[PDB]
Amino acid sequence: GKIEEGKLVIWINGDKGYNGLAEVGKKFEKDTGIKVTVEHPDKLEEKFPQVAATGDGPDIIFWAHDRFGGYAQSGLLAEITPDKAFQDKLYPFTWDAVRYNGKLIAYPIAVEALSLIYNKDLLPNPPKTWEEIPALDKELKAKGKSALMFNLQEPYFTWPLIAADGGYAFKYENKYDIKDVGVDNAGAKAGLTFLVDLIKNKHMNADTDYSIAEAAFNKGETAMTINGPWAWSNIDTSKVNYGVTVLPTFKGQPSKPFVGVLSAGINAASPNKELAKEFLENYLLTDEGLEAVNKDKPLGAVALKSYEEELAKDPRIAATMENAQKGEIMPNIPQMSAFWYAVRTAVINAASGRQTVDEALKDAQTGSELYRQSLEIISRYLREQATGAADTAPMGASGATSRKALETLRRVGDGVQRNHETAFQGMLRKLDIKNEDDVKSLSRVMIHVFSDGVTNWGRIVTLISFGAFVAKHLKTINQESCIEPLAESITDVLVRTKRDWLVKQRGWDGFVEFFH
């Protein structure tokens, strides 16, 4: 392996208490003589899967739980095995946030929700509604102050307002419906339009980012910001007289933050998995370990029952959990990163005027839907090609698109498979695909062949058509069970390598129109 044996390398994001975490590492080091190194890499959430995909990287990775499903799907995480006694030390819903396909894939650390943070000296009674913020900004501007500044470059911070009047990511009612995406519905449009109107009317600036908003609040220039518990330390230092409270309502509805559980995963490629377990269970997830990190930058409502009993007495934590209860724990489906990228682009483009709100959110909808919709089309095609019989089940949400895409794929794919039969036979013989482990190795090959050159729908049909050819083969040799992981692999390659192009074509609607 590439990861060094007999030491621990730990990666955590730069807005967390990494010096406090390093103190916990030093205690581990003192006991054992084993080196512990804490780093906070730039763009951590993208750097980790890049390096781990090659069998490299840190032993332990920290992030909110939403990204861990994708990491697990990609084989980048070890299944964790806490014993019953340890599990019973943390709240059950925090374990729920780090369960993926029935397996625990990380240790939960703390519950994060955004709150409204306000300067009591400027704004002793913070607004209950978003709607009153323009007038409040006018009053404050007369005094050389602004009402509100927060990070407009990460959709995490704008999401609560988008979700307020009915925007949603993937439909949840008790039960998910991942095919059902609510990124460009009327509620989402209303929320984002209100945000863009704030910018148009000079109550906010589209360029405001994390550092700019934090500095303005901590210098006493803006009366409000929106942030999580990690931000409280720097406000303490600034000596601003601040409060932490419920987010404003929009159209009478609560703002609904996406709630994260800061979690610690173990690299699948680590030769130090037992060391990592010992560190996390016996050093970090203890009253003294969490206090060391919390004293650096507050964690929020921690997963460890014994310590949370103390933290819960803090009105700032009470406010954190009040906001959390009005929001929703993030999914950890593997396309969460694509959802976030899609909405990130929509907010930035709407705020800058590069797109209208309507067209921005339409693109984010398509981007968010891409994986599940492509998988439905591709899986159905590969299966009916293997067996000869079509799936009689209803398509579900966006069913017309999925149905017409499959119809188009059948028609165009028939010609492609006929004309490419000799080429496909040759490639199949060269690849020698015998089983599920062989199928798992195909992703790298696909990416190599499919990434280079101009993208068009014909090439995408050839990708999927060779998939169907391989699926027929797998069926013939009594490996029919391999067809679904084959479809998942092809889908992953398609939507990752051609994301921007696919959104530009309006996804599968463009496919249907191109070949009408």
Ligand SMILES: Cc1cc(OCCCc2c(C(=O)O)[nH]c3cc(Cl)ccc23)cc(C)c1Cl
């Ligand atoms: C399911 C699967 C699909 C693949 O498609 C690669 C991109 C489409 C393609 C191209 C292309 O990108 O132009 N050329 C091919 C030649 C053959 Cl014989 C088969 C496929 C193509 C390639 C592989 C290795 C696998 Cl396993």
Ligand SMILES: OC[C@H]1O[C@H](O[C@H]2[C@H](O)[C@@H](O)[C@@H](O)O[C@@H]2CO)[C@H](O)[C@@H](O)[C@@H]1O
């Ligand atoms: O903005 C999209 C982003 O949102 C969340 O990231 C949060 C993170 O959970 C917090 O701990 C803190 O670091 O702020 C981040 C926002 O800048 C998701 O967890 C993340 O995956 C997503 O990209």
Ligand SMILES: [Mg+2]
């Ligand atoms: Mg568009």
Ligand SMILES: [Mg+2]
């Ligand atoms: Mg649609």
Ligand code: NA
């Ligand atoms: Na007052």
